[PDB]
């Protein structure tokens, strides 16, 4: 594939943190019908292609900057965002499902603690969450 | 210390799986808020993010009620299922779509800077890049035919 087709290490390298996004309201607060729906900060339409539109911090990667992003592809800096600051990228995908599956999808090892019986109730789930020996870890997962 | 290193988890059996995130929202479930069935899992339990969170899996692999420890997510109780959740597949519940984007989808990686931009980009410039002759062989893997 493209990752192996060229010696990319001849180009400058930048460590970044990257998430995915779509043109939809969950990312942009805009919906179909809005005048600027689907349009990046630069004015060009969002695109997932050989060269895809990506979001970055203009002070780090100016608009028009061409990047190669492993496991995503070639990217042209065309968009920006309030949360997109510093060494941060946001990668355009067509659908929320694509963000979940093409960037969010992770292969990893999980530990099987107890085989289930086929049932679970609210009471049992509450009992598990009230486990005394684990309350010290609980604030790390509770939102409230 | 983090839960991920507070116990010798390798004492327990290990299962390689492919995992994604989901929410109660319509993008995942097709249900809208106001629906009395909104946020209701297959097991009849309400979706929950907590010490023990509700996760989705294939019952034939992980029966309902199965407790897992998923690194960088937490302890999970299999309480949900899904048409696409088959085989060694897990779907991890998050409260919002942004949480799925940020808390699961966020990756630290190196990218290569091919060319620094001038501060402007046009549709025609982007089109010409995508029409690069020597790269049309690679284009099938990114374009959605
Ligand atoms: C919270 C946050 O930073 N959201 C970003 C996320 O990353 C890129 C994209 O989605 C971004 O949306 C773009 O915001 C810019 C600044 O308000 C707008 O000028 C762009 O038109 C908008 N892009 C699109 C495709 O709508 C969000 O602001
Ligand atoms: C595409 C797909 O499989 N989506 C899944 C995704 O993973 C778990 C959850 O979201 C799942 O939603 C649950 O579907 C089950 C039937 O398949 C229903 O019985 C559950 O009530 C439903 N869960 C919720 C919280 O609505 C989606 O079907």
Residue numbers in the entry:
A (entry chain B): 73 to 216
B (entry chain A): 72 to 216
The authors write:
However, a dormant state in Firmicutes can be recapitulated in the laboratory. In this paper we present three high-resolution crystal structures of YuiC, an Sps protein from B. subtilis. The overall fold of each domain of the symmetric dimer consists of a mixed direction six stranded double psi beta barrel surround by five helices.
Incubation of YuiC with 5 mM penta-NAG in the crystallisation results in two linked sugars in the final structure per chain. One of the sugars is a NAG that occupies the same −2 site as the sugar in the crystals grown in the presence of NAG monomer. The second sugar has clearly formed a 1,6-anhydro reaction product. NAM can easily be accommodated at the −1 position as the O3 of the sugar, which has the lactic acid group in NAM and then the peptide in peptidoglycan, is pointing into the solvent. It is more likely that multiple cleavage events before crystals formed have led to a predominant two sugar anhydro product and this form bound to the dimer may have been preferentially selected by the lattice. We have also trapped an 1,6-anhydrosugar product in the active site, showing that formation of a 1,6-anhydrosaccharide is the product of the reaction.
